[PDB]
Design an enzyme around this catalytic site. Structure first.
Site: not given
Ligand SMILES: *[C@H](O)[C@H](C[C@@H]1CCNC1=O)NC(=O)[C@H](CC1CCCCC1)NC(=O)[C@@H](NC(=O)OC(C)C)[C@@H](C)OC(C)(C)C
Ligand SMILES: *[C@H](O)[C@H](C[C@@H]1CCNC1=O)NC(=O)[C@H](CC1CCCCC1)NC(=O)[C@@H](NC(=O)OC(C)C)[C@@H](C)OC(C)(C)C
Lengths: 306, 306
Positions: A41, A143, A145
């Site tokens: 991603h 960040g 990830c």
């Molecule tokens: C990458 O560094 C990051 C790590 C997370 C941010 C905060 N804590 C983490 O572990 N991953 C993401 O931000 C991620 C982005 C990608 C986008 C495309 C593929 C999916 C993930 N997004 C999330 O982790 C979000 N979660 C999410 O959308 O889960 C859905 C409901 C299945 C987070 C940032 O959103 C919250 C509001 C915290 C759930």
């Protein structure tokens, strides 16, 4: 003596971490030989994230779109390829710090150490388990990830986890190093939920043995129980079934303490039925399930790596 | 999100560990530049341990009595000198992996990461605090002497602890890297005891702020309390006094959450008076005191090192 959540020394992994930047997205990569692994991603953005389609997204990218930085020295991407949910960026330089390593897909209940990273720089190290619902209770900010989970076996780093996402409940989901998610999660921004979790019973049993090896004996009893009768009580308290394989794995711990495994099961049964009554075990007021039988043997006996 | 006992990445310290063998005793050394630091009781044996006298013992040793091994490459001791309770072995080779480093003597309540080692090979890494009684609740087996405790501050390793001994109660005692013991302990085999311990109140407060930053709010209240009135309740539960300096240090955590420090103190007061009533905070059923205010800011915000 004493007992601690112990992570593996992280030096062999620190030497592999890099920062990967494409478009507006910066995350962490794993540099082994001349390949940098990272979550796919990274080719998404804020409107690519809704319902992506990564094949289409990846054919539109050129090698020079991926900015890959190892220290104040940034590498040249000379090729890329997608494998399940991970990108493999081919770089023109082999990492001279590449350890002996393997990629392994672990079972639920198994533990590993996580090296948390931001902008390619390690931040801290801690121990986690793959929960029965295939999430991990990590500590991850934006960040992070691309941070990996790993075990160490003599001088070989067995990589088992790459971090992708956090779920609404605060737990965490990701892939093995070949890009397959643990659990039913997919890398889209669509409603997903963890699914009911359960306590890793074999690990609890292993930690009670750790307690006995360290001098706690207060929770033991004279009683015993059969495996069926233990499993009937474990079910009621949301514990996983204990299999005969689990019993066998707990052999050495049994043999070293003189407590038959079924006898330790009778202890856990009474512990689950009466609570701990204001006492602690190995400094914990809850029954702890993130130590495997191997973890206890390693720490209570003293295995190293070089 | 999430909250974990996080140790610093240990690679810069792994690169310094060596095995030191003299007579029948093998322990761990710290190789920085061309000096290897280790506990001076390495020149003892099983009958030297009763009531030693290390000056007399050290004048009887020749340089070739110290066998110092870094990997399958063992170093040549070209001089030695005692400083308080540590030996400094001069070797003919500078460690090329010597990080930027400092030696610091830490205060009680401060935390650090411990790289546990046997035969010069790192075994595992974990986070500890200097208890108010100047012991540490470590995890140490025979041969772990010479393992160090450290913090990391950008690229500088602040070494703060070298391991010497375990006490009858299962806790652990050692020195700063200049050989001064923490606490009233001495390196003899004579009856010594830890002395009553107390809970590190500022750290508890800091971990409740961690809980609020991560979404736990159930323990807060509308009430407040003065500092005197908080300290009167803390004394009763074996907590240390909270000073105005502690209040100030907890400023950023207060400012980020909108909970005045004295208000969080009223929360802790009721938590101490009524127990947790079968709830948990950040996965713990006990109030946790081995996170400093700096630890919480680092983990909940995401500071790294390179
Ligand atoms: C990458 O560094 C990051 C790590 C997370 C941010 C905060 N804590 C983490 O572990 N991953 C993401 O931000 C991620 C982005 C990608 C986008 C495309 C593929 C999916 C993930 N997004 C999330 O982790 C979000 N979660 C999410 O959308 O889960 C859905 C409901 C299945 C987070 C940032 O959103 C919250 C509001 C915290 C759930
Ligand atoms: C060095 O590697 C070792 C580390 C300890 C062994 C088990 N766990 C440890 O942390 N240190 C020792 O074994 C140490 C030897 C020297 C001898 C001369 C100077 C003093 C220490 N001995 C101990 O730690 C013993 N403790 C002890 O004598 O404390 C007295 C009561 C003040 C331990 C090994 O004995 C037990 C029975 C465990 C207390």
């Amino acid at each position: 003596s004493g007992f601690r959540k112990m992570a593996f020394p992280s030096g062999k992994v620190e030497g592999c971490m890099v920062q990967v930047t494409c478009g507006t997205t910066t995350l962490n990569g794993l540099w082994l030989d001349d390949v940098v692994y990272c979550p796919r991603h990274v080719i998404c953005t804020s409107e690519d994230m809704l319902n992506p389609n990564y094949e289409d997204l990846l054919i539109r990218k050129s090698n020079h779109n991926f900015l890959v930085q190892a220290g104040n020295v940034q590498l040249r991407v000379i090729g890329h390829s997608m494998q399940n949910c991970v990108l493999k960026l081919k770089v023109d330089t082999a990492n001279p710090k590449t350890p002996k390593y393997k990629f392994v897909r672990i079972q639920p209940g198994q533990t590993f150490s996580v090296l948390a990273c931001y902008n390619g720089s390690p931040s801290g190290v801690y121990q986690c388990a793959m929960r029965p619902n295939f999430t991990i209770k990590g500590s991850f900010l934006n960040g992070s990830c691309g941070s990996v989970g790993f075990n160490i076996d003599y001088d070989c780093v067995s990589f088992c986890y790459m971090h992708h996402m956090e779920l609404p409940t605060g737990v965490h989901a990701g892939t093995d190093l070949e890009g397959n998610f643990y659990g039913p999660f997919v890398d889209r921004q669509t409603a997903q939920a963890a699914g009911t979790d359960t306590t890793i019973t074999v690990n609890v049993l292993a930690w009670l043995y750790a307690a006995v090896i360290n001098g706690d004996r207060w929770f033991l009893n004279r009683f015993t129980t059969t495996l069926n009768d233990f499993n009937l009580v474990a079910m009621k308290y949301n514990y996983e079934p204990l299999t005969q394989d689990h019993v066998d794995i707990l052999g050495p711990l049994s043999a070293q303490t003189g407590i038959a495994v079924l006898d330790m099961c009778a202890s856990l049964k009474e512990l689950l039925q009466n609570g701990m009554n204001g006492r602690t075990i190995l400094g914990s007021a809850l029954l702890e399930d993130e130590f495997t039988p191997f973890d206890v043997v390693r720490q209570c006996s003293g295995v190293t790596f070089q």
